[PDB]
Amino acid sequence: ALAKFHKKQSLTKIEEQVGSALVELQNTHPDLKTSLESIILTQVKEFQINKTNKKAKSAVLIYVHFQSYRVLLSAARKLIIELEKKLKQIVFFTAQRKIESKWVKEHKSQQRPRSRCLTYVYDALLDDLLLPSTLIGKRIRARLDGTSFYRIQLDQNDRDFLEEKLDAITHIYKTVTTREVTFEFKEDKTFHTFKK
RNA sequence: AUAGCGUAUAUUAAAGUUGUUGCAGUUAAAAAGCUCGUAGUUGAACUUCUGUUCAGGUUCAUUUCGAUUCGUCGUGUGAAACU
Numbered sequence: 385a386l387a388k389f390h391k392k393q394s395l396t397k398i399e400e401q402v403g404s405a406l407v408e409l410q411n412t413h414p415d416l417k418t419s420l421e422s423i424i425l426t427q428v429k430e431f432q433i434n435k436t437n438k439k440a441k442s443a444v445l446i447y448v449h450f451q452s453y454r455v456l457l458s459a460a461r462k463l464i465i466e467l468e469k470k471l472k473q474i475v476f477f478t479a480q481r482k483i484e485s486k487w488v489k490e491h492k493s494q495q496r497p498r499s500r501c502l503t504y505v506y507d508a509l510l511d512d513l514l515l516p517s518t519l520i521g522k523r524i525r526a527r528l529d530g531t532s533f534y535r536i537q538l539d540q541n542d543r544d545f546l547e548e549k550l551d552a553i554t555h556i557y558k559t560v561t562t563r564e565v566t567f568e569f570k571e572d573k574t575f576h577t578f579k580k
Numbered sequence: 581a582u583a584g585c586g587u588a589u590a591u592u593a594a595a596g597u598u599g600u601u602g603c604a605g606u607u608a609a610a611a612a613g614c615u616c617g618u619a620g621u622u623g624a625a626c627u628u629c630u631g632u633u634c635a636g637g638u639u640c641a642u643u644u645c646g647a648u649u650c651g652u653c654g655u656g657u658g659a660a661a662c663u
């Protein structure tokens with residue numbers, strides 16, 4: 385299952401595990417055939433989440449190569465559902481994203497596109513951390529000391545999926561992104577003129 | 581006022597009575613009869629945010645302490661904004 389990676393050269397126990405998983409799946413499910421055909425992985429990181437629960441929960445973040453992204457997003461629910469089954473942890477997916485530095489412009493003729501920027505990329509990471517669902521809203525809080533703070537408003541209907549994942553997400557985001565993230569569930573409010 | 585003191589004239593403050601700071605324009609002087617428009621002046625938001633760690637001063641405070649004196653130094657400790 386080095387076929388599932390871009391380096392193929394070296395893989396951790398964790399990456400051996402995920403590779404073998406995606407193998408097992410491309411074999412079992414005709415559902416995911418095409419989707420797992422097109423998905424190549426760059427990287428896999430593992431995380432340990434320890435909370436006041438005394439529950440130490442292993443959580444896995446897997447990095448899809450950018451060209452597999454559309455297909456990944458198409459297969460997301462089925463995929464995370466089956467992968468959470470094949471390992472006793474929970475899974476997340478991201479796109480592998482480069483970041484171009486502000487003041488070191490390497491080539492005279494290349495304008496660093498905003499698609500790769502510290503911010504935009506980090507934000508995108510959040511969008512992926514929630515991946516089956518989406519932000520209903522996002523707000524930033526300034527505390528009195530000068531700490532920035534994030535809090536995010538989420539579709540009611542997706543509570544089932546996202547409830548336990550929250551801690552994992554805040555741990556991951558605090559780690560990679562350096563950001564404090566909070567969540568809320570509201571109902572998605574559509575403003576309709578209904579004719580009764 | 582005073583070995584000086586009147587007067588005339590230009591100029592300075594008085595003057596926010598030339599106004600960048602800083603004026604006015606319904607009725608005291610003051611918005612052009614009305615639109616288009618070139619020079620001129622004027623221009624929406626986004627890009628390494630951010631946490632951690634070490635040092636160095638510099639300010640800050642003092643139920644930290646000291647040292648001397650007519651008040652500086654040293655030392656805390658923490659607070660910081662740094663670099």
Ligand SMILES: [Mg+2]
Pocket residue numbers: none
């Ligand atoms: Mg009149």
Ligand SMILES: [Mg+2]
Pocket residue numbers: none
């Ligand atoms: Mg501007």
